[PDB]
Design a protein around this ligand. Sequence first.
Ligand SMILES: CO[C@@H]1OC[C@@H](O)[C@H](O)[C@H]1O
Length: 189
Amino acid sequence: RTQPTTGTSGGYYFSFWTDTPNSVTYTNGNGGQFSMQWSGNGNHVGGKGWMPGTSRTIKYSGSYNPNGNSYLAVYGWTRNPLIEYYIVENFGTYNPSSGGQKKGEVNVDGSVYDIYVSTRVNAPSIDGNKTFQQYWSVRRNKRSSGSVNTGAHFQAWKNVGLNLGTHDYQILAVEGYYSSGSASMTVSQ
Ligand SMILES: CO[C@@H]1OC[C@@H](O)[C@H](O)[C@H]1O
């Protein structure tokens, strides 16, 4: 019953979703810039990227400041099979991959990522209420700027048996869940 405000801005595809519009302010800037700012109640996920996504190298920079449940990550979806994937570059409080079965590890882009897999039952997705899997690559050394070899993560996932379907959208997402925080992030290739 909540569908995301999608579109184009600065030569990039953008997606911004929230169940509490008054708790969060999402703003598109020139180029690949976007700024999100939130506090209090609500679930907010916003960002800029590509549609569809692929095995590309995603450069990004800017400031990211969390206070509670929040993450800065390369975030996207695939179909057949339906899969939500994360390349968590940064996060606050709470490790978003908590409760995720660890499938392995991978060393890429100046750090080591832990690989997890979890399952969401009867949860909101790009195809509405469905049961789907989530792939996780969590960066041990958090950062707010750098580059992400998504293809490398996809390969490392494919090794441990976490295969993907045909890609939907692929954005640099800032997320906040019943917390406060703010980020000004510019994306690039
Ligand atoms: C948090 O998951 C959200 O759930 C609904 C989908 O429409 C959005 O794309 C996705 O971000």
